[PDB]
Every structure is written in structure tokens, then in C-alpha cells.
Symmetry: C2
Subunit: 256 residues, 2 copies
Amino acid sequence: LTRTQTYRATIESDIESYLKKAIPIRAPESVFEPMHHLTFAAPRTSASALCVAACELVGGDRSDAMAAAAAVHLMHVAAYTHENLPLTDGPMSKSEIQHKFDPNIELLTGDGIIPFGLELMARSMDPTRNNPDRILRAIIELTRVMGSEGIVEGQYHELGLNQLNDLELIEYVCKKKEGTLHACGAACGAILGGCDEDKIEKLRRFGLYVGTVQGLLGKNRSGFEGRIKELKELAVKELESFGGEKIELIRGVFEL
Amino acid sequence: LTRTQTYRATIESDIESYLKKAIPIRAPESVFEPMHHLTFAAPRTSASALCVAACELVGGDRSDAMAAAAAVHLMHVAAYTHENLPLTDGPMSKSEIQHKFDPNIELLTGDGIIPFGLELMARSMDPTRNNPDRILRAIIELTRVMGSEGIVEGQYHELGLNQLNDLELIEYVCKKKEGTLHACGAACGAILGGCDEDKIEKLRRFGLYVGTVQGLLGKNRSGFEGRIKELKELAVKELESFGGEKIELIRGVFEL
């Protein structure tokens, strides 16, 4: 592996180890079995690593952002689970997955995973009395990503979908789902990192741009090459205000 | 109406109006339409009123509990929405309701409502009081009600309940759903009104007993009347060592 890959993977290993301490497979039974299973079977999102990297970029330790990064992963897991949830007329996502558990169980496990991430984030503060306004602000960010400003807005418009036709509607969905998830990750990193009000906004915009790109790639319909270079350039702009070699690894992680 | 009824109705009206400020009908536009519809169509839970009442009881102002009380209502509506949600096998709840919106929409709207309440709660921080510690502690309580310690655990076990069933299993379901909901409301009430560790747990237990009664009552299928009287006196016991006018009103609301 390259320095960049090693860096992403180590972050992702630290996140997974952090979650494993919080969610025992302790089951068959209690929500814990489907909660443990869905969390670690789900595809990862680069939004979780951006959270940690954003925090380090501004001088935080990674233990400062571990709870946030894990919460980001969990919001994503909750969204992913509910998107692939078989309803009356099947799931919202047309690309089918394997299900080890019944629909009813996936529904409630998704419901339990949403606040669990916010509970971990809420319960991280306090050991020596750390950042109550900060952790509260981080919580605001995560609540924003899951709801009407973020993922659920995206999923709402994802319903009226068409075959690679409405490109602006597709982009909008990517911005609201993968976009908002990265924005939140980056903004949490920065908040927990102890950051300028101005520098939070910038990393937030950064996350939005790379998250939208990550979304668009996940469509892979190519009608987007020009928009992708457009957004990548905006991502770089935001980065210019920071520095210190973590910049290079972050640029690396996001193919910039 | 009696003083007790008026007192409860005023609270419920103050909660509704506080929520009406936060969720626009927005007409068709966005998840806000179903979010608004489902919030104000859903049956109320007394856990919401207990929050305000618990707060006032310990010298709190009601505007201090208003966000919490609304968040409690919202947790209850997300739960209600999801358990009546038509799946492949139909809804988890055997008691059918009317559905103005499609299953897929109800699934998104439920997911948006969960963090929204926590966001309302989080955005209520009072830097001129000491709230970041307090409000953060309130968020812990609400995250608890929704998850593995609460409603989801209850719903998980409720799966596979019929006639002539496990009575201890039924009470357990009531404890985890209605019980935890009231326990959280009461405990948030206490936290936000500003009392100590000892008195918070007393109100949380109070909430648990009365919530468990509300759940058992909301079934009335056979022989619970014995256990219901046992739980009511447990609730009164908790109320000893609290004082004031509000004690009679709370005893009234919950018929102790």
C-alpha cells in the first residue's frame, strides 16, 4: 500500500475497532445481533475517514473524532439498511443485496442505529470535562445529515427517478446523500479539532464537493465527467486555506 | 374540564404550537409534508406532558422543557409510523390505521423525524444558564428511549405476540416502549428543571412505572389489573420527597 492507502485503511481500522467495543455481537437476541451484523457487513463510506482526517488536519488527535467518525458510519449504515429494505413493492434501491434478517428486523435495527451513533457521540464528552458546546455542535451536524437537510431529502427525490435522464435531479440526490454525509464528517472533524468558525464552513464545503463526487461515481453513468472535474476543482479551492502534509493525504484519498 | 385536565390540555397545546413553528406543511414540497402530516395525525402520548410537568415540579420553567417534550412526541411518532408501516408481510402492528402516504415515504419520514427531535433539543442550548452539560444529558436520555434500551428492544420482542400469550413478555414490551418513553420524558423534565442525580432517577423510575401502566392499559387484554395497582403505588412512592402544587396535578394526570 501507498502512504495514502495505509493512512485511509488505518483510520478505517481504528473506526471499526472503536465500533466493535460499543456493539457486541451479544446475540442471537436483543437488537444487538442484527445491529452488530448490519454495521460491519455494510459497505464503508469515505465520509467516516474524512471526519478523522479533517480533525487531524487542524491539530486534533484522532481519539477526539473517533466517536463522530463512527456515528457518521452508523448514519450511513442506517440509510443503507433502510434503502435496501424490502417493502410492499420491494426495496427503494433497485440493486439487490443479500439479507440475513427479515424486513421487520432490518426496519427496527435501522431505527436503533440512528440514535445509537448520536448516543456514542453524546457520551464521549465529560471524562475530564471536554467540549460540551463542541460535542453539542457535532451532534447538530450529525442530526442535519440524517434528516430533511440531508439523506432523507435525497432519498425522497430518489423515488421519482428515471434511467440516466434527469442529470440535475441525479446530482441533487448525490449532493443530499453522499454530499451531506461527507460535509458533516468534515465539519465534525473540524469542530472537534477546535477550529475557526470560518474554517469549519470551508471543510464543510470541501466535504460536500467530494461527497457529491463520490455519489456521482456510484452512479457511473458517465454523463457527469465535466461536473466531476468542476466539483474536484472547488474541493481543492477550499483546501488552500489549510496545510501541513495531511493536505496531501486527503487530496490523495479523494483522487484530487 | 377539571384543573388536572385543563393543566394537561394546556401543556399538549403548548407542545403542538411549539412543533408547529418547526415543521411547515410546506404542501407537497419535500419530506416536510409527510413530516408535518404524520406528527399531528399521530395519537399523543402522555410522556410528552410528563416532561413539562416533571420540569415545573422541580422549579423549572416550561419553556425549558418544551423542546424535550416535543422531541419525546417525535420519538413516539417515528416509532408509531414504523410499527404501522406496511412491509412485505404487512405492518408490525396488527391494529391497522389509514395511510395517506405510501410505505416508502412513511419509511423516510420516520427516519427524518428521529434526528429532527434531537436537533430541536440540541438547538435549544442556553449559554447563559449552564445547559451544554444539561442539554447534552437530555440528548443522552432521548437517544436511550429510541434505541436498544428502549422502543426498538420492545418492538424486537413484540414480533411474535398473539392471544393467550406470555404475560411477562407483554409487560416487558410495555416497559420498553411506553415505559421508557415516560421514563425519558420525566428524566428530561428533571434534568432541564435542574435537580440532582438522586431526584432525576426518582423521576425516571416514576416515568417508567406510569409508562408501563399506560402500555398495559393500551391493551386491556385480560389479566393485568393486579400488576397495574402494584405499579401505581410504586409511582406514588417515587413522588414522596417531591413537593408543591404540581404533585396533585401529576397524580391526577396519571390517576394515582
